[PDB]
Design an enzyme around this catalytic site. Structure first.
Site, PDB file in Angstrom:
ATOM      1  N   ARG A  99      69.124 -16.712   1.780  1.00  0.00           N
ATOM      2  CA  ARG A  99      68.709 -16.409   3.140  1.00  0.00           C
ATOM      3  C   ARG A  99      68.591 -17.665   3.940  1.00  0.00           C
ATOM      4  O   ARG A  99      67.856 -18.568   3.564  1.00  0.00           O
ATOM      5  CB  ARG A  99      67.375 -15.664   3.137  1.00  0.00           C
ATOM      6  CG  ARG A  99      66.760 -15.451   4.493  1.00  0.00           C
ATOM      7  CD  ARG A  99      65.604 -14.466   4.441  1.00  0.00           C
ATOM      8  NE  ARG A  99      64.929 -14.430   5.737  1.00  0.00           N
ATOM      9  CZ  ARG A  99      65.386 -13.805   6.806  1.00  0.00           C
ATOM     10  NH1 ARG A  99      66.516 -13.093   6.776  1.00  0.00           N
ATOM     11  NH2 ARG A  99      64.696 -13.900   7.927  1.00  0.00           N
ATOM     12  N   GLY A 100      69.353 -17.731   5.032  1.00  0.00           N
ATOM     13  CA  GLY A 100      69.275 -18.854   5.979  1.00  0.00           C
ATOM     14  C   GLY A 100      68.382 -18.421   7.112  1.00  0.00           C
ATOM     15  O   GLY A 100      68.564 -17.342   7.670  1.00  0.00           O
ATOM     16  N   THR A 101      67.411 -19.259   7.472  1.00  0.00           N
ATOM     17  CA  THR A 101      66.453 -18.892   8.494  1.00  0.00           C
ATOM     18  C   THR A 101      65.799 -20.150   9.092  1.00  0.00           C
ATOM     19  O   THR A 101      66.211 -21.283   8.825  1.00  0.00           O
ATOM     20  CB  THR A 101      65.398 -17.873   7.941  1.00  0.00           C
ATOM     21  OG1 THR A 101      64.692 -17.212   9.006  1.00  0.00           O
ATOM     22  CG2 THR A 101      64.434 -18.495   6.925  1.00  0.00           C
ATOM     23  N   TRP A 102      64.811 -19.887   9.930  1.00  0.00           N
ATOM     24  CA  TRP A 102      63.949 -20.879  10.533  1.00  0.00           C
ATOM     25  C   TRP A 102      62.506 -20.524  10.250  1.00  0.00           C
ATOM     26  O   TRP A 102      62.155 -19.338  10.186  1.00  0.00           O
ATOM     27  CB  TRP A 102      64.182 -20.921  12.037  1.00  0.00           C
ATOM     28  CG  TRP A 102      65.571 -21.310  12.474  1.00  0.00           C
ATOM     29  CD1 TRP A 102      66.682 -20.489  12.567  1.00  0.00           C
ATOM     30  CD2 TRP A 102      65.996 -22.600  12.889  1.00  0.00           C
ATOM     31  NE1 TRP A 102      67.766 -21.221  12.990  1.00  0.00           N
ATOM     32  CE2 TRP A 102      67.360 -22.511  13.219  1.00  0.00           C
ATOM     33  CE3 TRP A 102      65.349 -23.834  13.019  1.00  0.00           C
ATOM     34  CZ2 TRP A 102      68.090 -23.611  13.685  1.00  0.00           C
ATOM     35  CZ3 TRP A 102      66.077 -24.921  13.484  1.00  0.00           C
ATOM     36  CH2 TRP A 102      67.441 -24.796  13.797  1.00  0.00           C
ATOM     37  N   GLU A 119      57.076 -11.478   4.153  1.00  0.00           N
ATOM     38  CA  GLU A 119      57.840 -11.228   5.382  1.00  0.00           C
ATOM     39  C   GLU A 119      57.433  -9.880   5.991  1.00  0.00           C
ATOM     40  O   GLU A 119      57.629  -8.821   5.348  1.00  0.00           O
ATOM     41  CB  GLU A 119      59.355 -11.226   5.088  1.00  0.00           C
ATOM     42  CG  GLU A 119      60.200 -10.797   6.288  1.00  0.00           C
ATOM     43  CD  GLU A 119      59.979 -11.670   7.534  1.00  0.00           C
ATOM     44  OE1 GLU A 119      60.244 -12.884   7.492  1.00  0.00           O
ATOM     45  OE2 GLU A 119      59.565 -11.149   8.584  1.00  0.00           O
ATOM     46  N   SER A 124      66.639  -9.784   5.309  1.00  0.00           N
ATOM     47  CA  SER A 124      68.069  -9.811   5.079  1.00  0.00           C
ATOM     48  C   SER A 124      68.429 -11.020   4.194  1.00  0.00           C
ATOM     49  O   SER A 124      68.009 -12.157   4.476  1.00  0.00           O
ATOM     50  CB  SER A 124      68.796  -9.883   6.430  1.00  0.00           C
ATOM     51  OG  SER A 124      70.182  -9.977   6.247  1.00  0.00           O
ATOM     52  N   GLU A 173      75.428  -8.103   1.951  1.00  0.00           N
ATOM     53  CA  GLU A 173      74.004  -8.057   2.293  1.00  0.00           C
ATOM     54  C   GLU A 173      73.132  -7.206   1.358  1.00  0.00           C
ATOM     55  O   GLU A 173      73.420  -6.035   1.086  1.00  0.00           O
ATOM     56  CB  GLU A 173      73.822  -7.537   3.711  1.00  0.00           C
ATOM     57  CG  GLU A 173      72.385  -7.643   4.211  1.00  0.00           C
ATOM     58  CD  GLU A 173      72.208  -7.442   5.717  1.00  0.00           C
ATOM     59  OE1 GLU A 173      73.188  -7.146   6.395  1.00  0.00           O
ATOM     60  OE2 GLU A 173      71.040  -7.531   6.190  1.00  0.00           O
TER      61      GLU A 173
HETATM   62  N1  LIG Z   1      69.513 -14.473   7.336  1.00  0.00           N
HETATM   63  C1  LIG Z   1      70.487 -14.317   6.421  1.00  0.00           C
HETATM   64  O1  LIG Z   1      70.765 -15.186   5.587  1.00  0.00           O
HETATM   65  C2  LIG Z   1      71.326 -13.085   6.448  1.00  0.00           C
HETATM   66  C3  LIG Z   1      71.907 -12.585   5.274  1.00  0.00           C
HETATM   67  C4  LIG Z   1      72.744 -11.458   5.357  1.00  0.00           C
HETATM   68  C5  LIG Z   1      72.988 -10.880   6.589  1.00  0.00           C
HETATM   69  N2  LIG Z   1      72.421 -11.360   7.700  1.00  0.00           N
HETATM   70  C6  LIG Z   1      72.783 -10.712   8.991  1.00  0.00           C
HETATM   71  O2  LIG Z   1      72.221 -11.441  10.066  1.00  0.00           O
HETATM   72  C7  LIG Z   1      71.448 -10.538  10.888  1.00  0.00           C
HETATM   73  C8  LIG Z   1      69.986 -10.681  10.488  1.00  0.00           C
HETATM   74  O3  LIG Z   1      69.671 -11.997  10.890  1.00  0.00           O
HETATM   75  P1  LIG Z   1      68.272 -12.567  10.401  1.00  0.00           P
HETATM   76  O4  LIG Z   1      68.132 -12.444   8.907  1.00  0.00           O
HETATM   77  O5  LIG Z   1      68.216 -13.984  10.895  1.00  0.00           O
HETATM   78  O6  LIG Z   1      67.249 -11.600  11.157  1.00  0.00           O
HETATM   79  P2  LIG Z   1      65.691 -11.847  11.456  1.00  0.00           P
HETATM   80  O7  LIG Z   1      65.228 -10.586  12.164  1.00  0.00           O
HETATM   81  O8  LIG Z   1      64.977 -12.289  10.192  1.00  0.00           O
HETATM   82  O9  LIG Z   1      65.577 -13.105  12.460  1.00  0.00           O
HETATM   83  C9  LIG Z   1      65.990 -12.909  13.820  1.00  0.00           C
HETATM   84  C10 LIG Z   1      65.966 -14.316  14.482  1.00  0.00           C
HETATM   85  O10 LIG Z   1      64.654 -14.894  14.380  1.00  0.00           O
HETATM   86  C11 LIG Z   1      64.700 -16.048  13.533  1.00  0.00           C
HETATM   87  N3  LIG Z   1      63.542 -16.076  12.619  1.00  0.00           N
HETATM   88  C12 LIG Z   1      63.324 -15.303  11.520  1.00  0.00           C
HETATM   89  N4  LIG Z   1      62.178 -15.603  10.942  1.00  0.00           N
HETATM   90  C13 LIG Z   1      61.640 -16.607  11.675  1.00  0.00           C
HETATM   91  C14 LIG Z   1      60.452 -17.366  11.597  1.00  0.00           C
HETATM   92  N5  LIG Z   1      59.551 -17.198  10.613  1.00  0.00           N
HETATM   93  N6  LIG Z   1      60.203 -18.255  12.548  1.00  0.00           N
HETATM   94  C15 LIG Z   1      61.088 -18.473  13.505  1.00  0.00           C
HETATM   95  N7  LIG Z   1      62.236 -17.826  13.696  1.00  0.00           N
HETATM   96  C16 LIG Z   1      62.463 -16.897  12.750  1.00  0.00           C
HETATM   97  C17 LIG Z   1      66.020 -15.967  12.729  1.00  0.00           C
HETATM   98  O11 LIG Z   1      66.498 -17.208  12.185  1.00  0.00           O
HETATM   99  C18 LIG Z   1      66.927 -15.304  13.783  1.00  0.00           C
HETATM  100  O12 LIG Z   1      67.405 -16.304  14.660  1.00  0.00           O
HETATM  101  C19 LIG Z   1      72.032  -9.161  10.626  1.00  0.00           C
HETATM  102  O13 LIG Z   1      73.262  -8.987  11.376  1.00  0.00           O
HETATM  103  C20 LIG Z   1      72.326  -9.241   9.123  1.00  0.00           C
HETATM  104  O14 LIG Z   1      73.381  -8.365   8.726  1.00  0.00           O
HETATM  105  C21 LIG Z   1      71.631 -12.443   7.660  1.00  0.00           C
END
Ligand SMILES: NC(=O)c1ccc[n+]([C@@H]2O[C@H](COP(=O)([O-])OP(=O)(O)OC[C@H]3O[C@@H](n4cnc5c(N)ncnc54)[C@H](O)[C@@H]3O)[C@@H](O)[C@H]2O)c1
Length: 222
Positions: A99-102, A119, A124, A173
């Protein structure tokens, strides 16, 4: 180094695409007796979760105040119930995912091995580190100080593949229902990036450690 493989550059488009197609095929093939009971509304809810649905659902789940949402709140609650129901009918995945995130720097600076991250939204992940990395590249405008995080997730419970209902993508996913708990097994902080090894844990099994809300950064009571 423990995270060397994920610090290194990516496999080719051809291979990543093939691995994602393979995972979609495996996901469909692993559909079990629970899958016969998937409703039309459940199938649609999950199909569109990856494109748009997650944005409203996860916002709702992370909101400090949903009292203001009106009709949208009733709709979001319904959508969440529907996706949760569907997820339990989809095949489990166990193994490694990413999982890539911030994350708030203020939270990151507290974290140790053994701490549990919770979480509030759906979580995801992808079986493919190449896909996961794509989600730590930019973030929405934000008033807090955020840092890039790449999670290596050992999944032994909770994760269900949605790749058998994601025809438009190559994302491999694996999704978790809200409130997923992940225990930190390793953390590395290097060159402004943070790599965190975590393992899925049952919330009722967490004992004598510190839990944190991954989104808000606030402690969660034992
Ligand atoms: N994140 C992954 O590695 C991952 C893996 C598979 C699929 N996806 C796809 O990407 C989308 C889901 O994206 P997501 O996982 O980033 O959704 P999310 O709802 O977790 O995050 C939405 C946005 O908020 C940011 N965010 C999340 N948690 C945060 C935090 N604690 N503090 C600050 N910012 C935060 C994310 O980086 C993103 O820019 C869907 O289309 C899904 O199919 C993502």
């Amino acid at each position: 180094g423990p995270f060397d493989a994920i610090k290194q550059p990516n496999r080719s488009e051809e291979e990543v695409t093939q691995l994602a197609e393979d995972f979609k095929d495996w996901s469909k093939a692993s559909n079990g007796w629970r899958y016969s009971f998937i409703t039309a509304n459940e199938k649609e809810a999950v199909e569109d979760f990856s494109i748009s649905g997650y944005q409203t659902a996860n916002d709702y789940l992370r909101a400090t105040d949903t009292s203001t949402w009106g009709v949208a709140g009733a709709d979001a609650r319904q959508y969440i119930r529907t996706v949760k129901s569907a997820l339990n009918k989809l095949p489990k995945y166990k193994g490694t995912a990413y999982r890539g995130t911030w994350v708030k720097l203020s939270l990151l600076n507290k974290l140790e091995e053994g701490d549990v991250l919770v979480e509030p939204a759906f979580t995801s992940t992808s079986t493919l580190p190449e896909v996961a990395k794509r989600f730590s590249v930019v973030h929405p405008n934000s008033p807090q100080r955020l840092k890039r995080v790449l999670f290596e997730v050992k999944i032994n419970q909770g994760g269900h593949t949605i790749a058998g209902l994601s025809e438009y993508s190559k994302e491999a996913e694996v999704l978790f229902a809200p409130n997923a708990h992940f225990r930190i097994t390793q953390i590395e902080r290097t060159s402004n990036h943070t790599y965190i090894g975590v393992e899925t844990v049952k919330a009722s099994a967490v004992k004598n450690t510190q839990k944190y809300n991954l989104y808000s950064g606030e402690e969660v009571e034992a």
